Amino acid sequence: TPWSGYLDDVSAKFDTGVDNLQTQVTEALDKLAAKPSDPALLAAYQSKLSEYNLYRNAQSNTVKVFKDIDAAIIQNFR
Amino acid sequence: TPWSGYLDDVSAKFDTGVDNLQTQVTEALDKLAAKPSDPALLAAYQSKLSEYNLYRNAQSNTVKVFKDIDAAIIQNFR
Amino acid sequence: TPWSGYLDDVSAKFDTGVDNLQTQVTEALDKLAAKPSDPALLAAYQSKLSEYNLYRNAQSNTVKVFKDIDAAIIQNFR
Amino acid sequence: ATPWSGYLDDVSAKFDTGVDNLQTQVTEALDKLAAKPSDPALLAAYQSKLSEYNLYRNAQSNTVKVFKDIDAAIIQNFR
Amino acid sequence: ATPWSGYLDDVSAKFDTGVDNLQTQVTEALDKLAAKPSDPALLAAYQSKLSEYNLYRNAQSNTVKVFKDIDAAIIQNFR
Amino acid sequence: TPWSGYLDDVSAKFDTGVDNLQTQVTEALDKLAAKPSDPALLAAYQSKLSEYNLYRNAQSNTVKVFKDIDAAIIQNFR
Amino acid sequence: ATPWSGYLDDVSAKFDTGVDNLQTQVTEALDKLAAKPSDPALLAAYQSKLSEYNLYRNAQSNTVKVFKDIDAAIIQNFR
Amino acid sequence: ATPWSGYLDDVSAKFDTGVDNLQTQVTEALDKLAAKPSDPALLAAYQSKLSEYNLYRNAQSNTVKVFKDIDAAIIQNFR
Amino acid sequence: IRVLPRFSADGQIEMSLDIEDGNDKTPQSDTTTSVDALPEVGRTLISTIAR
Amino acid sequence: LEEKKQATVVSRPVLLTQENVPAIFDNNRTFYTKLIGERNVALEHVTYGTMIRVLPRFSADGQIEMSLDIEDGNDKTPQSDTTTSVDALPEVGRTLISTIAR
Amino acid sequence: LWIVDLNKSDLERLGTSWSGSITIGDKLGVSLNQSSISTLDGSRFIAAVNALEEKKQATVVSRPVLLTQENVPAIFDNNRTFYTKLIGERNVALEHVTYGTMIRVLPRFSADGQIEMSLDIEDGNDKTPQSDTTTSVDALPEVGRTLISTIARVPHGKSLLVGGYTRDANTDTVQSIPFLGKLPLIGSLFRYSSKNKSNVVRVFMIEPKEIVDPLTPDASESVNNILKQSGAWSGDDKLQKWVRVYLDRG
Amino acid sequence: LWIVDLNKSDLERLGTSWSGSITIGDKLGVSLNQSSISTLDGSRFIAAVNALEEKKQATVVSRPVLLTQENVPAIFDNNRTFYTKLIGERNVALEHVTYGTMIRVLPRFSADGQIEMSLDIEDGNDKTPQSDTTTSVDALPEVGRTLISTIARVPHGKSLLVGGYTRDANTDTVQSIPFLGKLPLIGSLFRYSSKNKSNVVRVF
Amino acid sequence: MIEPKEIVDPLTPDASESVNNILKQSGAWSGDDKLQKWVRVYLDRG
Questions:
Q1: Neighbour-count burial for A8-42, b at 16+ CB within 10 Å, e otherwise
Q2: In which order are the strands placed within the sheet that holds J64-74?
Q3: What are phi and psi of B75, to 5 degrees?
Q4: Maximum Cα–Cα distance for chain H, whole Å?
Q5: What is the secondary structure of L103-145 as a DSSP string?
Q6: Residue I32, Cβ density class (10 Å: 0-12 exposed, 13-18 middle, ≥19 buried)
Q7: Which residues are registered as beta bridge partners of K3?
């Protein structure tokens, strides 16, 4: 039985957003490794790696911004 | 209607001020998660989220200032 | 059987609220420690550690406020 | 047998029979905390127990003083 | 000859005898770190020790003050 | 006696998680120093130094966060 | 006798007596290198020296600040 | 006649005579750093001196008030 | 249980009784095995006389 | 894994007094044990202590009557961090007695 | 008053501990006495070997002296600190211990020629050392903290035991691997063993005497010997004699 | 009043300690007294050697003087400080110690020509708060902090010993490897040993 | 377990004797010193 907060929800939204990218990247690397000298493989990997990098960044920056809001509201109880 | 205090009225003025931001900010996220690498989407979400941040901080700070005015008056009834 | 006060009740509500977070943070930290660089472990851990920080802040500030509301009444018996 | 006790003692003792174990809990909580003074699970607990102890003692003494003043003000009228 | 100790002294002593060795660990850490400041193995340890020391001292002081104010409030009602 | 606090027990997790990296790095450097132009060795050392860097960052950031969680609670006793 | 020195003074000075001669070695290398700026053996030396000096001065100032905060937090509770 | 000095004066003066020369060290180190504001040695020295001075003045002024509050509490009971 | 017994002349026994029983209300039951393994029993209080 | 353990401790305090005069005896001591491993840097310790209050009386029967208060033991220690010290320094209970005997 | 402390101890530890792991087929993992998950390259064992033996003996004697009149209460009190210095001796870290003692007494003369006294004794080492390495414990002997209060009377010039304490203890422990610990030729490789023995004696003895006659030789006449024998003597300076003359004698 | 302090010290340390680690083709690893292996194939053991002897002696003598009138109480009080430079004299702050002495007295004349005095005496070195250089203790002798309060009476111009203390102690320790420490020719490589002896006298 | 005894006679040997034996047997003895004797005489001789 899981338990999830609000930051958990926000984070998971990106994971359920990008349906398969996490497998796609691993298999593109998997085949590229077998033949590093092929242009079509290089061109495919160049894209997927970038999509992945931007995905992870936007995720972590959003989660920080929310944490910074909550931390500032709770401060005003005292 | 339920009982609402003066601090509740003050709080609610903000919520009713920003009519739709409360949901615009969520729709923006649902869209951006679909294609995290669209600059047209990113440029919109940055704005909505900044607006949300300023809204919540102004809200809490105002509430606290009125709490400390009332407490200071109530102290002298003795 | 043991005695528990009103402040203990208020505090306990949070503990029984966050059902499992105390275990989730421990196991997520051990899974990270096993491979200190894996994007999925980092992305999970950042969320759980943030939720933990907010939980402990909200709990302690609330108990403080109630303590002051009580002391302010006891003072008037004199 | 048991030592003589007045009305003010019965009042003071009510609180102590009310808080069954607080006097012990406040000690053991402190020894757990002081053995590892950097665990938030121990700290959040101790904050609660120490607050409860404070309010307990402080309410007990004020109640006893008010009953003293009521009696001294009645006795002042015998003369 | 030996010090009279009150109650607050006992409270402080619980912390002092709680952190058995930290008082000296911190100093040794500093000595070697200062000998060779550019070693991240030394740095990573000293950071932990110094933080533990900070928390220990802080908790000790805050606790003592609370007991002081409970006692003061009880004593006031004697008058 | 090796008295350890909570932060100590946290920090020690990473030291036991990275079983051997500390020695591995030193050895890889020891051999590479003897023959800087062997790419089979340069490629090894790049990976070990990356792993080391990420490990020391994650460790000191996590310790710093738990210090603030504790200090915040301590502050409220008064 | 010797100019009065407190705890913070005696902490800061520990670093200075830890890095026995670095304060001179930095100026020495700096002058040697300024004598012939285009010499790789000098550049590779001065990079190391200056990096060491930076880390040392930085960690010194941070530690002195932390030990100021630990004291001020205690002094505040006297009142 | 010799200038009259009480118990609070005595307690206060113990600090001034306890810190032999700090009171002037902090003036010299200022005139130096002001003469050459961009030398790290002078900065690293002045940080220490100014910290020690700040802590000295706080501990002094709090202790004098704590004593004043005892004397004022006893004198109230003469009535 | 708290009790005070009185002997009847008939040899009957009369007792002033106070009883309370149950689980302490700390619901650990976040996970299926908890509820599967550990029986809930109600929290109950009674006070009466019987002979 | 299989393990066996055995321990044995005997203490004998002695106190001089006079008839009808109350008296007190009180001691505690620390014991240290070197702990191997960890470059043999490690050390462990424990404190044992005992206190006795007494009031003697002489019967005409030649019997002696004693009013006694005894408190004894090792200090409670949640801090235990190793095997070998618990293998090397015995535990003993914390015990209190108050009674009269002749 | 005489105070005596004697201590003896003997320690031995000897043997091994084993643990390890194996991976087979990358499909079954096996591990031996490990409380943790394993990295599954396998074929990895550790044998931790310990072997040490030690003996220790210590002895301390102390004897305060105090002069009093009849019926007059008197007090004696004395603290002292001792230091030890460690290799790397240029480095500023002395270990130290503080011992202190006090006596409060009230004497009475009996017609029978017996001395009766009311006594407090408080004595021992301070509770709170900060030894981090064993060097301080092996250098400077611990003694308890001990407190006594009582009344006693002793025939003139004899002596008496007011209090004492003795403690004796022994400990044994052995561990082994259930099947291997009994192998005929190698069983000893799978065993661990330890033994401890301790004995302690502490006693307090009092011995009063009546003082009728003053000191002979004169104090100064002894001091003059001590100073010269020690070479501390400096009364030879033509400059100091000018004033020492007023102090040294009439 | 005569105060005299004498102190003798004898110290010795001698012998060795051992530890290390072994590996067999990454099959098995072994540690001797160590809690982590070097990943080394029976190589880089470590031996720590100690060999030192020291003797020390110190003597201190002090004598105050105070004039008083019959039946009039009087007080004398002195406080003084001493310094030592250190070797490695480029920059080593002066070590110092402070001695202090106080006497209160009230003299009475007997009919038999004896003098009787009420006395309160307090003399000592002040306690060092926490830590000091190993050299300072070498140069500046430790003395106790002692307090006496009593009445005494003395024949004219004679003297009395009002109080004093003596301490005597000895200690010895030996560490050794259970089987190697017993070898006829090399056991000394596997034994370590220490001795300590002290004798102190103080009188008034 | 408790075990009381009446005391009627002092120690035998005297403390001064037993202590001296322990001192000499342990080599703690120091009265051999040429210098300390000047003072110790007052304590042991009187």
A1: bebbebbeebbeeeeebbeebeeebeeeeeeeebe
A2: J94-101, J64-74, J43-58, J23-34, K145-155, K114-125, K95-109, K74-84, L145-154, L115-125, L95-109, L74-84
A3: -55, -30
A4: 63
A5: EEEEEEE-TTS-EEEEEEEEEEEPPP-S---HHHHHHS----E
A6: exposed
A7: K62, K204
Measuring CA to CA, which residue among A61, A59, A60, A63 is closest to residue A7?
A63
Experimental method: cryo-EM
The answer, for F74 touching chain C at a CB cutoff of 8 Å, is: no
What residues does J50 pair with on adjacent strands? J27, J72
Q: Round to whole Å and give the CA distance between K65 and K207.
A: 10
Reported as half-sphere exposure (CB side, CA atoms, 13 A), residue D55 has a value of 21
- Which residues from chain D sit within 8 angstroms of residue F69, using beta carbons? 40
Pairwise CA distance, residues C9 & C16, whole Å: 10
| Contact (CB, 8 A) for L120 and L73 | no
Resolution (A): 3.3
Residues 6+ apart with CB under 8 A from L112: none
Instruction: End-to-end CA distance of chain J: give it in Å, rounded.
Output: 51
Strand partners, J65: J57
Contacts of K161 (CB under 8 A, 6+ apart): J14, J16, K203, K204, K205, M11
Residues on chain F touching C53 (C-beta within 8 angstroms): 65, 68-69
d(CA K96, CA C64): 45
Q: Which of L118, L161, L122 is nearest to L144 (CA)?
A: L122
- With CA atoms as reference, report the closest residue to G15 among E41, E37, E53: E37
When scoring E12, E23, E30 by the number of chain G Cβ atoms within 10 A, the one with the most, hence best to mutate, is E30
Cα distance between the two ends of chain G: 33
* Distance of alpha carbon F46 from alpha carbon F49, whole angstroms: 5
- Domain range summary for chain H, segments of one domain joined by +: 1-79
Q: How far apart are CA G37 and CA D46, in angstroms?
A: 64
d(CA A44, CA E57): 58
Q: Where are the domains of chain K?
A: 1-212, 213-250
Residue I30: closest CA among chain A residues belongs to which residue?
A1
CA distance D15 to D57: 9
Q: How far is E49 from chain G (nearest CA, A)?
A: 12
- Nearest Cα to Cα of residue C58 among E54, D33, B2, A6: A6
Kindly state the tokens that stand for L195: 């001795």
Antiparallel, parallel or unpaired: β J43-58 and J64-74: antiparallel
Q: Tokens 């738990």, residue?
A: F66
Please count the residues of chain F: 78
Q: What are phi and psi of L183, to 5 degrees?
A: -70, 140
For chain H, give the number of residues.
Answer: 79
Contacts of M29 in chain L (CB under 8 A): 168
As a whole number of angstroms, the distance between CA F20 and CA L38 comes to 11
Chains H and B touching, counted as 3 or more CB pairs less than 8 Å apart: no
| Cα K192 from Cα J5, distance rounded (Å) | 12
J66 chain-M contacts, CB cut-off 8 A: 2, 4
Question: Are D50 and D6 in contact, with CB atoms under 8 Å apart?
Answer: no
> E7: helix, coil or strand?
coil
CA angle (J43 as vertex; K169, E31 as ends), nearest 5: 160
E strand or H helix that includes residue B55:
helix B39-74
Burial class (CB in 10 A: 0-12, 13-18, 19+), K230: middle
Interface M:I, ≥3 CB–CB pairs < 8 Å = no
Pick the closest to residue D35 from F1, J74, F65, K35 (CA basis).
F1
What span, in angstroms and rounded, lies between the C-alpha atoms of E53 and G70? 9
